[PDB]
Design a protein around this ligand. Structure first.
Ligand SMILES: Cc1ncc(C[n+]2c([C@@H](O)/C=C/c3cccnc3)sc(CCOP(=O)(O)OP(=O)(O)O)c2C)c(N)n1
Ligand SMILES: Cc1ncc(C[n+]2c([C@@H](O)/C=C/c3cccnc3)sc(CCOP(=O)(O)OP(=O)(O)O)c2C)c(N)n1
Ligand SMILES: Cc1ncc(C[n+]2c([C@@H](O)/C=C/c3cccnc3)sc(CCOP(=O)(O)OP(=O)(O)O)c2C)c(N)n1
Ligand SMILES: [Mg+2]
Ligand SMILES: [Mg+2]
Ligand SMILES: [Mg+2]
Lengths: 525, 525, 525
């Protein structure tokens, strides 16, 4: 067998059947004779290839396979990798290298010091020392991406390797099962359960690894038994809990003093599937107030090490959430009462308030919609206004890197063909991976893109206000016609300048048989 | 509180009370006002500082703290780190950096690009961005070294940081408990237990993470219930099983074809606490023969990813060994029969055969002795001839880096004051960290060093034979007087040129109140 | 031709005929059939292999070739590399890697992520992607080490590569000549010459790249024409000027305020072949006083970039010193007058003052002696008391990493068989690479080692005084018998407890036909 044949066999035996790619000449020997059972998803720029794969992985809860072109293709994707690192996305990134005979002279398209290029944003990064090693290296990549804590990995392959003879002993790679589905030993688990049972005012804080694990329903059982309020950890990249459940208390503010104040009076705070914590703004104070202690369950030793307070347990989030939900006592305390509905903001017949857009989306979208956020100044309102009952219903760029939601919405919709994906993207963010629109058009992946157009980088105007920073250049982005960009890439486009047109545009988009972009004229900050 | 005071408080609250060091000027601000409850162990060169700390950590089963001088001190220790990486040793390596005001100009003793210096041989490597951050960075280092898979970490600290004010919120670091004591979820554990119960001819292979976990006695229960032979995985850095137990079958040959041949006819091979596998020699063949399947339990995702065959489970070795030993059925098969005793090699009245040295050590040493091996051409004989009943009884440089056993024997004897440590070290290996002898003399740490003197790098002469390599230079090391080197560093010294003198020298050394070196005239290969 | 044959041919064609090494099993395929025209110099530990090669390179002014064993051998040498980096030493470091077929599984002796291991202390670090590439990679290593700014480089080679067929086109590597012998263009050179001619009170500061370039005699002509005082830049690793020439003013103090004060009243300060500057102690103040401007000529862009003041020119030191010495006008100012001789320190019949040792060395040593310093608390006195008329007469560990002078003295004496090498090494420093003594004994390289025994790390006691640091542990090193360590490794040994015995020991050592160690009882600080 050739290295090509053995590698595609390994991939299909490990569950991989799709290649997200932008091709190049170092990759033609890999892509030729492309197997009939695989499907290649082209995108026009690498940040878009990786963003699509990333949404697909996160929504499918399985690794996604990427193929990029040498150094420049890999480099074009590094902002996307920054997000994938922070979301623990299982991404297997492969890039073609020059033929081994041309690497020394550094011929054009040589990826110099290849394994160092994607660092520090990958779990494992490698170039094999011979062609026969490529299937074993690919095996290592699959498992490194897929073990807890999941994350992106990188394999560089000289293009001459593919046609070489494979090692016949590579067949032992094909059916390897590797598990990291582990939980705290019985004795220590019992100590943890007794501490939860004994708490007089417990709180729960949930992060994105809960949704990744599909542990959401176990965490609802846990919060119901403990009769405990549930917050989402700050800077949330996913939604880990039904947002209209009576226990739900919303997104935590990403500040040190805000969070200790929020948690005051809670004696035991249990954090599951989040870093402790992904703060953002400068908000100095106590990490925790007197009387509050914290216990974190994380799948990631780097999170456990860097928490400034609390105990920690490094284990699988699905296994831990399930064990705790089934072991804790039913508390005799009263179940928390549901937060009230948000108020309607006054809206005239002109530009839309973001509140109005979310309220209308919530009124019209199916109950199993999936939302993506890259509307940076409207996050708090989005979280208050969208009822998200099901898992896998929210994604926001986990490292803050814009250019995620537009491609990732396409990957998510590919992963979940029966759930309507709606990406709400600011006019600033929409440009970073605008070319991804073409993939949705070409493959007919029926994502709806809602572009919030207020003409400015609104969140940066807000941070500038907090800093009291005057005379900052580069904050305005006038003069973009999103309907013309959608036409550019083959996607039906609509404009909503007021509420009547927003309703009509949403009705048409929800009825459409393909992707749709709606440019919404929003109020300027 | 100062950063100095808060950092020593963090260390003592996390169980650390000893600093293994070779001091320098960037470290004086850390070492001044050295706390009365800590103890500083000086060694004269950094490979020796790290080798001592390493033996201490491995034998104590807890992290050890090291303090070295900037770049050159850290660089002198990098071979030692190579071993510590492969043995999963929990080493917290700190090094002093220049004052922050002098780093830019690259004053003398600046550690340039400090965090990259020890890579790839550390789990985590860092320099803090401010003085107030140093206690949190130290906390991160403690936990990264201590979480499974354990390993060395590196922290660089500008010398001006220590006298700065600490953040009052650093107190939340002091009592953090972080656990990685986890095992496979119940459902999958039950599947694994049923596969073991159902095996018709199971084999067990154990590696060094079993001894690190003190899981040895659980693995004896497991092998007794399964009525299964037990091998030690190849290239063994520790001994995970009593070597005269009836199930024990010895050290596996470090070759691919040798191991598949050994395992042939075994239907399920369970590997615990080892890489799969640490092969050495070139020995191409099948990874496993038809009819054999393998299941590995490892604490290290990098081991699980790179195994060329088998299933794998990434979990704590102590938690997994205990759970399996207590859950499996007692098989009705007959218990394996003990291997026979090794034969006596003919010995005349002249130079000693290595076989004779081990046989005599076994005759005379206490039953709780601890041995270290750095006699590279005699390993197989050592394993056959020393009855090691207890855990923590054997150490051999885990990456093959010579210069480990002499210092590590001193650390081990410090960790285990009531167990006689006996290091058997070839005349070649003895030179790499010869200066460590001074530490044993100065602190009166009563290690016995047995130097196997055959005048040559014997194992390299053997590998040269296997390669059929002629005219190789640099293989002979004549003209070293080990009794004079021991005198140099204050250690009592004895010579054994025949068996009568070997017996007398061992009797005197075993009776001594301090360290002793015995130079033994061994047969030339 | 094989890769082995083509590589040794490349080496001899590029002037390399000696391999400094400590062998291992990954290197046997390289070392077999060792060519009859090469010479292998064995040392017992890698810091000693690299220190010997380093002295040899620095004194010979040509690259030296090193061969080490995989990761642990390379790691044992990293402190030595830290020095070699700061001295711009042209060192070609090769290390053996596992066979390519065993790298993936990480067999024992695999050097993982090999090219990153020696960073940041090398100019270039690489592992070839195929066997046929090895001679080109070796060519790259030779030239990267040898081009200005010279420095260490690293090549990792899988052991199976050597017996493979070489590319017949590799012959084009054999006779490549690569020059970096360059100087500032004529127009800008003329501007610089006119500025020097016009200076009313010029000063010259010289660093180690002057001695490396053998530009010393040109700098004497330059200082004589400009009638300018000459200082050696701080933290000096080499001596660039005759120390009894009338222009010589000694070693600059390594502090910011000290140097600006020293230079005050000098209108133009010309620095040649040094960083600007290698400060050490904390000594805040003005980089330069009003009225002083600085112009640096360096062979190293990293030095030019990081100078906090002055203009800079990046060019070859030999070409620039020669051009300036021949172009500048003879000034009509009076030639500087020679510094007076140092005074005799009162010495009784007991322990030796360091002043007395240097005074006696200066009285007895040949006028072409070469000295090495690793007596850290006595540097200023050494510089005042040794008349060093010739180039290549002084070496001190350029990064401050102890363990350099003892091995490097052996390399220097190998490079300069007709110049008596005398290494003055403190009792603390002597331990770091003590095993190097064996190389001098085995090859009969007649270095004289003068061990300054005061029982303590004296310079650290001094820095502790400056810091006002009390209760510092680990500063004393009692209980070392250097005569016994020399006997250990086959080197004749003498003791001097007073001046009479110092004189007699020096007379005997200067008369000896092989290496000699003298342990000198010096006054305690
Ligand atoms: C790749 C990339 N480039 C730049 C940025 C900086 N940045 C961002 C940030 O540095 C801040 C990110 C942040 C931080 C905390 C919480 N949420 C977001 S926001 C932004 C403007 C986006 O404008 P738009 O999409 O029109 O939405 P709003 O009008 O609602 O704000 C910018 C430019 C970024 N985050 N990522
Ligand atoms: C830091 C370092 N430097 C070099 C080496 C290479 N090496 C070694 C290796 O490359 C091989 C290591 C090895 C490989 C597999 C199994 N066991 C050991 S062995 C050795 C000689 C040691 O001689 P000595 O202590 O006198 O014992 P024997 O006479 O019984 O053999 C050498 C030099 C090494 N392993 N580590
Ligand atoms: C590899 C290594 N390890 C540690 C150090 C730290 N250090 C040193 C330093 O951190 C300081 C180096 C320095 C700094 C500026 C100028 N000169 C030297 S000096 C030293 C003691 C050496 O003792 P000894 O040889 O007996 O001579 P003296 O009695 O005359 O001082 C030590 C230990 C070091 N420089 N290098
Ligand atoms: Mg906007
Ligand atoms: Mg030997
Ligand atoms: Mg001293």
């Amino acid at each position: 067998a050739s290295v090509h044949g053995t590698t595609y066999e390994l991939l299909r035996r490990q569950g991989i059947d799709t290649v997200f790619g932008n091709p190049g000449s170092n990759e033609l020997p890999f892509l030729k004779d492309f197997p009939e059972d695989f499907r290649y998803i082209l995108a026009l720029q690498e940040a878009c290839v990786v963003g699509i794969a990333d949404g697909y992985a996160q929504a499918s809860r399985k690794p996604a396979f990427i193929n990029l072109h040498s150094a420049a293709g890999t480099g074009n994707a590094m902002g996307a990798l920054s997000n994938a690192w922070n979301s623990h996305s299982p991404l297997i990134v492969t890039a073609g290298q020059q033929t081994r005979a041309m690497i020394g002279v550094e011929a054009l398209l040589t990826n110099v010091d290849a394994a160092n290029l994607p660092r520090p944003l990958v779990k494992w990064s490698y170039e094999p020392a011979s062609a026969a090693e490529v299937p074993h290296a690919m095996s290592r990549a699959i498992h490194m991406a897929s073990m807890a804590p999941q994350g992106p990995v990188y394999l560089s392959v000289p293009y001459d390797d593919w046609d070489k003879d494979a090692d016949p002993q590579s067949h032992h790679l094909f059916d390897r099962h590797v598990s990291s589905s582990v939980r705290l030993n019985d004795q220590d688990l019992d100590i943890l359960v007794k501490a939860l049972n004994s708490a007089s005012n417990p709180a729960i804080v949930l992060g994105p690894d809960v949704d990744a694990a599909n542990a959401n329903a176990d965490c609802v059982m846990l919060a119901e038994r403990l009769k405990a309020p549930v917050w989402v950890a700050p800077s949330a990249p996913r939604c880990p809990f039904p947002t209209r459940h009576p226990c739900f208390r919303g997104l935590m503010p990403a500040g040190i003093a805000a969070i200790s104040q929020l948690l005051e009076g809670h004696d035991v705070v249990l954090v599951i599937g989040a870093p402790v914590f992904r703060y953002h703004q400068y908000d100095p104070g106590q990490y925790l107030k007197p009387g509050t202690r914290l216990i974190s369950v994380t799948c990631d030793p780097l999170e456990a090490a860097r928490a400034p307070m609390g105990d920690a347990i490094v284990a699988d989030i699905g296994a831990m959430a399930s064990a705790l939900a089934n072991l804790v006592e039913e508390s005799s305390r009263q179940l928390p009462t549901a937060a009230p509905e948000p108020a309607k903001v006054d809206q005239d017949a002109g530009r839309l308030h973001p509140e109005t857009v979310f309220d209308t989306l919530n009124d019209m979208a199916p109950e199993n919609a999936i939302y993506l956020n890259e509307s940076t100044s409207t996050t708090a309102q989005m979280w208050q206004r969208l009822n998200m009952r099901n898992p896998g219903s929210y994604y926001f760029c986990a490292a803050g890197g814009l250019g995620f939601a537009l491609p990732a919405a396409i990957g998510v919709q590919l992963a979940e063909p029966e759930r309507q994906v709606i990406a709400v993207i600011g006019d600033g963010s929409a440009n970073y991976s605008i070319s991804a629109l073409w993939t949705a058009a070409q493959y007919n992946i029926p994502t709806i893109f809602v572009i919030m157009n207020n003409g400015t980088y609104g969140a940066l105007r807000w941070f500038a206000g907090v800093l009291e920073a005057e005379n900052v250049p580069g904050l305005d982005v006038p003069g973009i016609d999103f309907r013309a960009l959608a036409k550019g890439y083959g996607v039906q486009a609509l404009k909503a300048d007021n509420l009547e047109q927003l309703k009509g545009s949403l009705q048409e988009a929800l009825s459409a048989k393909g992707p749709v972009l709606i440019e919404v004229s929003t109020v300027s900050p």
